[PDB]
């Protein structure tokens, strides 16, 4: 491996890019981050246990290190601000998911100087599967990004929408500080739609003790939440119990088995927006009441708001009605102490002001695929040839991906590639349908291979992004800054 030698030649010469906010020190060892263009490495001068413990090939006083998992574990031991940490429910957080592992620095640059704590490490099991990555890689990218930008005020790591215990225990063992319980397998959607009297049928099949609990505690009682009162008729109480009861036992069993016993602060987010019905406020209140009655420490709750929260696009539905429902949801979270969490929050610009107002800035908003879409925007401005090939590839495999994400995409709205010049290509990522076409097809585009073996687009994509890194980063700052401004952050 000759290059390690020359790179150091190129280094102390001074024609090599060093990230200016990346110099840190531990005892006698100084550490820096450099780009020997095309690639990123760690460089360590000095002498001390951090130099010795980093792995990489040396030359006199200098060691060149790849951004590996194990070098990340070493930096963790010497540099605390590179370890994920939890933030608690009296805070403002934003989940900045990165399907590529290259969005970190742009993300840090956006939250620098804003009153928000970033969850830089956030991926779901599906996203991992559709991209061929493990959770170690997700934390590695986030940790290396805060070291690159010298951002010491902290970041978190979120296991998004976990449903299986093996994945729960795995996320904890790897140091995840935030866990989002999915709870879909246990939500009884059948009961959420079923008509009345079928709800009474099934309700009265419930143990006497259970009905005596929920009825002695809720039936024909009214609860003050803020200025809003919530009253439980017999009809809604019975539907609620049937929709959520098994999901509530699951939340309690997960919390007691894995969260209470973790022996370190963990931010526990419960997701219940994977119900075909919106989450009524009485539903929300009862769930919370049951959890908080058994002393569970919730970080946030994600309800299903009225209307539609689809990937890629702004809100669909009646904004005044969403406002009425938001006002009560925010008030329920206030009574019980946790935050409201907004899934599929990205590009939902119509609701950000409302969310900032009614939660008085105390919220969680999750983004992800937007970030991949901003990368796709860069490919369309600087490598039109590459974008055309993917856009067409996306179009041909679009039916496949709608199994995984629920979109009402209208392909008839996407102008045909033949009818748009190269210069117009970027504008596709302003359009609802084209944005959704490339959002949900990321997994298919990332894994596609030439019929010999090598990647069909993935290597060219990352090569393009690496060389246009200054524009991607500036695209992220502009796109994500717009979210935070609309949220009213800082």
Task: Tell me about this structure.
By secondary structure, the protein is an alpha/beta fold. Among the domains are: about 5-75, no CATH class; about 370-480, no CATH class. About 45% of the residues lie in helices and about 15% in strands. The strands form three sheets. Strands 8-7-17-16-15-14-11-10-9 form a nine-stranded parallel β-sheet. Strands 1, 2, 3, 4, 5 and 6 form a six-stranded antiparallel β-sheet that branches. The longest helix is centred in the middle third of the chain and has 26 residues, at about 235-260. It is globular, with a radius of gyration of 24 Å.
Write the layout of secondary structure elements.
Blueprint: H1 3-13, E1 17-18, E2 24-26, E3 29-36, E4 39-45, H2 49-53, E5 57-59, E6 62-66, H3 69-78, E7 93-96, H4 104-111, E8 117-119, E9 121-124, H5 125-131, H6 135-149, E10 157-162, H7 165-173, E11 178-181, H8 189-193, H9 198-203, H10 208-218, E12 222-224, E13 229-231, H11 234-259, E14 267-272, H12 281-293, E15 300-303, H13 319-336, E16 339-342, H14 349-358, E17 363-367, H15 369-382, H16 384-396, H17 398-401, H18 432-439, H19 442-447, H20 458-467, H21 469-487
Parallel strand pairs: 7-8, 7-17, 9-10, 10-11, 11-14, 14-15, 15-16, 16-17
Antiparallel strand pairs: 1-3, 2-3, 3-4, 4-6, 5-6, 12-13
Helix pairs in contact: 4-6, 4-21, 11-12, 12-13, 13-14, 14-21, 15-16, 15-21
- Hey, roughly how much beta strand do the residues contain? 15-25%
Strand line-up in the sheet with most strands:
8-7-17-16-15-14-11-10-9
How is the biggest beta sheet arranged?
9 strands, parallel
Helical content, roughly?
A: 40-55%
Q: Give the termini separation.
A: 48 Å
What does the overall shape look like?
globular
Radius of gyration: 24 Å
Structural class: alpha/beta
Number of helical elements: 21
- How many β-strand stretches? 17
PDB class: isomerase
Keywords: UxaE, TIM-barrel, isomerase
Assembly: monomeric
Entry title: Native crystal structure of fructuronate-tagaturonate epimerase UxaE from Cohnella laeviribosi
């Amino acid at each position: 491996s000759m290059k390690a030698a020359s790179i150091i030649e190129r280094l102390a010469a001074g024609q090599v890019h060093v990230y200016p906010r990346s110099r840190h020190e531990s005892e006698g060892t100084r550490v820096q981050m450099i780009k020997a263009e095309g690639r990123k490495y760690l460089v360590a001068e000095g002498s001390g246990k951090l130099y010795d413990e980093l792995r990489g090939e040396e030359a006199d006083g200098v060691k060149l290190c790849e951004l590996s998992h194990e070098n990340r574990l070493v930096l963790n031991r010497h540099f605390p601000f590179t370890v994920p940490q939890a933030f608690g429910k009296q805070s403002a957080t934003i989940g900045l998911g990165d399907r590529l592992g290259i969005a970190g620095p742009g993300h840090v640059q956006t939250v620098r100087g804003r009153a928000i704590h970033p969850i830089l490490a956030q991926q779901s099991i599906r996203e991992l599967a559709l991209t061929g990555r493990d959770y170690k890689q997700v934390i590695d990218a986030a940790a290396y990004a805060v070291f690159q930008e010298g951002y010491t005020e902290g970041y978190g790591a979120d296991g998004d929408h976990l449903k299986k215990e093996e994945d729960i225990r795995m996320a904890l063992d790897l140091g995840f500080t935030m866990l989002t319980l999915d709870c879909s397998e246990q939500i009884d959607n059948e009961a959420a739609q079923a008509g009345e009297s079928e709800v009474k049928r099934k309700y009265e099949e419930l143990p006497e003790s259970v009905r005596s609990h929920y009825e002695a505690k809720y039936l024909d009682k009214t609860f003050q939440v803020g200025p809003h009162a919530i009253h439980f008729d017999a009809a809604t109480l019975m539907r609620d119990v049937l929709v959520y009861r098994e999901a509530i036992q699951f939340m309690i069993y997960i919390y007691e088995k894995y969260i209470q016993t973790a022996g370190r602060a963990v931010d526990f987010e419960i997701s219940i927006d994977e119900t075909l019905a919106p989450t009524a406020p009485g539903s929300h209140f009862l769930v919370a009441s049951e959890l908080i009655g058994k002393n569970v420490d919730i970080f946030s709750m994600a309800p299903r708001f009225i209307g539609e929260f689809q990937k890629g696009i702004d809100y669909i539905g009646d904004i005044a009605q969403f406002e009425r429902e938001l006002a009560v949801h925010a008030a329920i979270a206030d009574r019980f102490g946790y935050k409201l969490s907004i899934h599929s929050g990205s590009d939902k610009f119509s609701v950000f002001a409302l969310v900032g107002r009614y939660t008085n800035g105390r919220f969680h908003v999750k983004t992800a695929g937007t970030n991949w879409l901003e990368a796709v925007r860069i490919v369309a401005k600087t490598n039109p040839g590459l974008y055309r090939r993917m856009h067409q590839y996306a179009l041909e495999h679009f039916e496949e991906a709608t199994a995984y994400y629920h979109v009402t995409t209208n392909l008839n709205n996407i102008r045909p590639l033949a009818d748009v010049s190269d210069e117009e290509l970027p504008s596709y990522m302003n359009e609802n349908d084209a944005r959704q076409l490339l959002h949900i097809t990321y997994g298919l585009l990332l894994q596609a291979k030439k019929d010999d073996g090598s990647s069909l687009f993935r290597d060219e994509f990352f090569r393009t992004l690496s060389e246009r890194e200054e524009d991607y980063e500036a695209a992220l700052r502009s796109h994500i800054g717009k979210h935070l401004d609309l949220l009213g952050v800082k």
